[PDB]
Ligand SMILES: NCCCC[C@H](NS(=O)(=O)N[C@@H](CC1CCCCC1)C(=O)N[C@]12C[C@H]3C[C@H](C[C@H](C3)C1)C2)C(=O)O
Ligand SMILES: [Zn+2]
């Protein structure tokens with residue numbers, strides 16, 4: 559009982575990854591890139607018309623368990639790819655020329671826990687030595703300025719950085735995947751909520767990236783594209799300057815691997831519902847977000863490297 563306009567539990571998303579791939583075998587393939595702490599398969603969808611030597615864009619959702627609109631968006635993206643390939647000029651060009659590696663739910667164990675026990679859970683569900691506090695923040699667990707200010711050394715904290723960079727199976731799986739395909743991946747997109755913000759590097763330190771001007775301009779344009787639909791207002795900028803220090807993030811790690819187009823999207827809303835965004839807003843949120851993602855994709859295509 560999957561619906562793109564409702565939040566779906568993991569069993570349902572999992573079955574959807576299988577069914578959407580089987581229904582669209584010339585546009586989608588599915589692999590498991592690793593397993594979670596609790597043993598769940600971490601699925602990755604490769605969306606695109608197969609071809610030789612294609613560049614790729616990587617996008618993850620559901621790094622954080624409670625950010626349900628993020629998981630909903632990755633599903634929406636794949637929905638749009640299969641629905642509009644052959645029917646809309648831009649998406650057609652995109653899937654011909656690029657592959658999208660879409661990881662619909664990174665932190666599966668945490669996501670299950672938000673359905674069963676605690677709707678507000680954020681972290682993974684791994685154990686910690688010397689305490690009964692559970693979990694590591696995957697977005698403080700990447701090897702980029704790892705465990706500095708903005709992450710916590712306290713396992714009971716929401717920004718706990720883990721026992722070591724890539725301590726979490728989920729983080730290692732994602733990083734291993736990108737490392738194994740680094741020469742093909744041209745952009746990194748990470749979907750989160752909330753606050754209506756596009757972030758680009760850096761978040762692990764107060765410093766601006768080599769291509770700050772370009773990323774500023776691209777973010778500004780993507781935010782403009784997004785607003786055209788419903789007038790939804792996003793702000794944007796380097797992470798540590800706009801948001802806060804948040805070291806060990808996947809976006810900064812990917813950027814330092816040489817993926818120069820790297821962004822974090824914080825979706826709706828601005829705090830009225832916060833993480834508990836009503837299902838009635840999934841459609842509008844996803845449709846407007848699609849415009850910003852497509853804008854960035856089209857830009858990357860015009861600026862291959
Ligand atoms: N990689 C670079 C960007 C990373 C941004 C990313 N943001 S997020 O975790 O997805 N969501 C954000 C949304 C909020 C942002 C400010 C306004 C109110 C909402 C979030 O949960 N942040 C906190 C911020 C602290 C520490 C810990 C628990 C509380 C307090 C909420 C996470 C991330 O901190 O990892
Ligand atoms: Zn998040």
Ligand SMILES: [Zn+2]
Pocket residue numbers: 638845
């Ligand atoms: Zn649509």
Ligand SMILES: [Zn+2]
Pocket residue numbers: 861
């Ligand atoms: Zn240019």
